[PDB]
């Protein structure tokens with residue numbers, strides 16, 4: 001039914017690249033930051049600052065981790081409840097490169113969401129929420145094990161979006177310096193990029209207060225993927241085919257009611273992505289996989 | 291009739307303390323006494339809490355114990371009791387050779403009562419949380435910097451390994467100091483796991499809390515480097531000793547047992563515990 005329109009997709013890539021230098025904006029690099037440089041936050045008051053230490057700099061890549069990288073079929077996996085029961089895991093995993101959002105869980109869910117991960121996003125506040133600030137031996141071990149399971153994937157850490165990341169960022173940095181060379185995970189650390197990314201989408205008449213992580217990943221993926229397939233983008237509380245109630249996340253327990261805690265216009269994002277699907281720019285999966 | 295110093299009895303106390311506690315060593319970790327990546331535990335929290343020593347933390351440690359071979363005649367140890375308000379003890383405190391203060395307590399607006407001389411002040415890392423907004427803004431960073439600058443060459447004695455609640459803020463503090471290396475004259479000191487060692491002297495004096503206070507820890511340190519110790523601001527009650535009218539807990543707003551023993555030591559002439567207006 002859906003048919004890829006490569007030429008229209010590549011036009012979109014070029015338009016994105018006119019506003020966002022994706023390869024550079026993907027991560028700060030060692031030679032682009034000074035020790036002691038003061039960072040501000042994309043989404044908080046200008047008064048919040050964060051000084052880049054020697055140790056932080058030592059974790060930056062030398063070159064962009066996506067410099068001269070090319071993947072034919074990419075999956076970008078959002079976290080919608082539409083994925084529960086979809087059995088999309090095999091198809092997702094056939095992709096050359098899989099992007100995941102907010103360190104989402106795969107363990108109990110691989111039949112639906114897959115096991116392949118080539119990039120996952122990681123707000124430093126994950127450490128506060130799920131790893132008790134790496135205070136104890138058990139917390140440190142649990143975090144280490146989570147990282148080891150990612151193997152050589154990219155861990156894409158936006159430490160300069162929300163000022164609430166600041167104190168936990170030092171804990172994350174210190175963990176990684178301490179464990180230097182024990183993990184194969186590739187660290188990537190975007191700087192202040194959301195002004196650039198917002199400019200592309202504003203011209204397409206999408207101007208929320210904040211773009212979602214999913215659409216940010218689409219944006220990055222456009223530069224290095226030949227063809228993008230979206231899964232788990234469905235910001236609604238019912239299944240479009242069966243009409244059954246859905247939770248917000250695929251990992252929510254069965255029966256959880258749909259709720260949004262927004263700063264996002266997800267339905268506005270979805271509408272535009274769905275238009276793009278119709279134009280053949282990208283494939284939005286909204287049904288069980290075959 | 292007046293308190294009189296009993297120098298013989300104090301010299302016996304100093305010797306007993308030294309025979310139970312290596313004060314010069316316990317005073318601070320040093321660069322060569324820790325290894326990068328060593329896991330520290332906390333004296334007063336469960337064993338499960340750990341903090342890994344970084345290159346940067348190690349870089350802030352002194353090479354040699356800052357109190358090695360130091361000897362001062364008259365020391366004041368100033369606790370933070372409200373009993374100091376209206377005491378007019380500032381001049382007498384400041385006449386001391388060396389003044390120890392507690393928890394970075396303010397002096398500027400209180401100098402008539404508490405003095406302005408400071409040679410050592412302690413600093414629980416949580417001070418950053420409570421008074422400096424975790425150094426989140428330029429204004430906070432500037433305010434902390436200015437506070438530090440006013441200490442000039444005094445020791446800042448930072449116990450980061452007593453309470454596990456110090457862990458996250460300690461990295462903020464370390465990063466601040468590394469970022470400002472060479473801009474401040476303050477001398478940093480970082481005691482390690484010392485409370486079990488300090489405790490051993492005080493346990494024999496039948497002082498038996500779970501945790502000894504900063505004030506009595508300061509007395510212990512002071513015994514090694516002072517000829518004579520005078521205490522101010524030790525009065526752990528919300529009420530005036532003479533009048534029983536409300537008194538704030540701090541002049542700038544376990545302990546009763548510590549106070550009782552310090553009072554006994556005063557009576558023995560080991561130390562002078564001031565509880566009244568100074569002349």
Ligand SMILES: *[C@@H]1O[C@H](CO[C@@H]2O[C@@H](C)[C@@H](O)[C@@H](O)[C@@H]2O)[C@@H](O[C@@H]2O[C@H](CO)[C@@H](O)[C@H](O)[C@H]2NC(C)=O)[C@H](O)[C@H]1NC(C)=O
Pocket residue numbers: 072073
């Ligand atoms: C890059 O991928 C394209 C597209 O592959 C197809 O669509 C994918 C989503 C997935 O379903 C694939 O298995 C499909 O083959 C490749 O183009 C196809 O190449 C095959 C085999 O050579 C050919 O029979 C098809 O006609 C082509 N399909 C289209 C739409 O062109 C392309 O070969 C891939 N290139 C590399 C180097 O991997």
Ligand SMILES: Nc1ccn([C@@H]2O[C@H](COP(=O)(O)OP(=O)(O)OP(=O)(O)O)[C@@H](O)[C@H]2O)c(=O)n1
Pocket residue numbers: 077078079080081101102104211212213214215232233234235236247248249266
């Ligand atoms: N029902 C849902 C839930 C999520 N998403 C998409 O999947 C991404 C990842 O979801 P989630 O981890 O829940 O992100 P949020 O917590 O919604 O927040 P943010 O986008 O700010 O990271 C979102 O950015 C959004 O694009 C969606 O389309 N429909």
Ligand SMILES: Nc1ccn([C@@H]2O[C@H](COP(=O)(O)OP(=O)(O)OP(=O)(O)O)[C@@H](O)[C@H]2O)c(=O)n1
Pocket residue numbers: 368369370371372392393502503504505506523524525526527538539540545
């Ligand atoms: N009313 C008071 C207040 C303080 N103190 C003494 O002054 C020291 C410093 O006081 P404070 O800054 O209040 O210490 P705390 O923060 O209460 O806790 P800690 O004693 O653990 O530093 C205390 O250790 C205590 O010995 C006192 O005797 N009477």
Ligand SMILES: *[C@@H]1O[C@H](CO)[C@@H](O[C@@H]2O[C@H](CO)[C@@H](O)[C@H](O)[C@H]2NC(C)=O)[C@H](O)[C@H]1NC(C)=O
Pocket residue numbers: 005007008280
């Ligand atoms: C792929 O998409 C492009 C871009 O929209 C299509 O090219 C357009 O075709 C429409 C419909 O006839 C024309 O009105 C436009 O003028 C064309 N624009 C450009 C820039 O070429 C193209 O038809 C699509 N391909 C397929 C197979 O649908």
Ligand SMILES: *[C@@H]1O[C@H](CO)[C@@H](O[C@@H]2O[C@H](CO)[C@@H](O)[C@H](O)[C@H]2NC(C)=O)[C@H](O)[C@H]1NC(C)=O
Pocket residue numbers: 018019020021022024025026027190191192193196
């Ligand atoms: C993100 O990419 C943008 C370009 O889209 C970068 O902005 C450009 O940076 C160079 C400085 O070397 C200037 O020559 C251009 O004028 C800038 N363009 C615009 C539109 O401002 C930006 O530096 C990148 N940011 C990061 C953190 O990588």
Ligand SMILES: *[C@@H]1O[C@H](CO)[C@@H](O[C@@H]2O[C@H](CO)[C@@H](O)[C@H](O)[C@H]2NC(C)=O)[C@H](O)[C@H]1NC(C)=O
Pocket residue numbers: 093096097098115116117118151153
């Ligand atoms: C994307 O990540 C996956 C792992 O999630 C990589 O696939 C693994 O590759 C290793 C090393 O060759 C194999 O031993 C594993 O069996 C593979 N696992 C899975 C789940 O497929 C894959 O190479 C990565 N792709 C890149 C980097 O392009």
Ligand SMILES: *[C@@H]1O[C@H](CO)[C@@H](O[C@@H]2O[C@H](CO)[C@@H](O)[C@H](O)[C@H]2NC(C)=O)[C@H](O)[C@H]1NC(C)=O
Pocket residue numbers: 296298299558559
């Ligand atoms: C100074 O303190 C010492 C030590 O406590 C006092 O000497 C003791 O005095 C008592 C009472 O006379 C004797 O029973 C002990 O045998 C003494 N011990 C020693 C080691 O001398 C001394 O009297 C104090 N000086 C005063 C009160 O002026």
Ligand SMILES: *[C@@H]1O[C@H](CO)[C@@H](O[C@@H]2O[C@H](CO)[C@@H](O)[C@H](O)[C@H]2NC(C)=O)[C@H](O)[C@H]1NC(C)=O
Pocket residue numbers: 310311312313315316317318319481482483484487
């Ligand atoms: C504080 O001083 C005490 C000695 O009073 C040190 O305790 C000794 O530590 C060594 C090495 O850990 C042990 O082998 C000895 O048995 C200990 N002696 C005693 C009497 O317990 C302690 O290491 C010092 N701690 C710090 C952090 O300086």
Ligand SMILES: *[C@@H]1O[C@H](CO)[C@@H](O[C@@H]2O[C@H](CO)[C@@H](O)[C@H](O)[C@H]2NC(C)=O)[C@H](O)[C@H]1NC(C)=O
Pocket residue numbers: 362387388389406407408409442444
């Ligand atoms: C104890 O600390 C005080 C500072 O609080 C030192 O006194 C200062 O000494 C400097 C340098 O000579 C003078 O410029 C200041 O006027 C003095 N200030 C005060 C308040 O007296 C004092 O030297 C220190 N004592 C020791 C023994 O280190």
Ligand SMILES: *[C@@H]1O[C@H](CO)[C@@H](O)[C@H](O)[C@H]1NC(C)=O
Pocket residue numbers: 363364
């Ligand atoms: C020490 O202080 C005492 C008490 O005022 C004084 O008598 C003595 O001369 C001082 N100086 C020295 C070097 O002992």
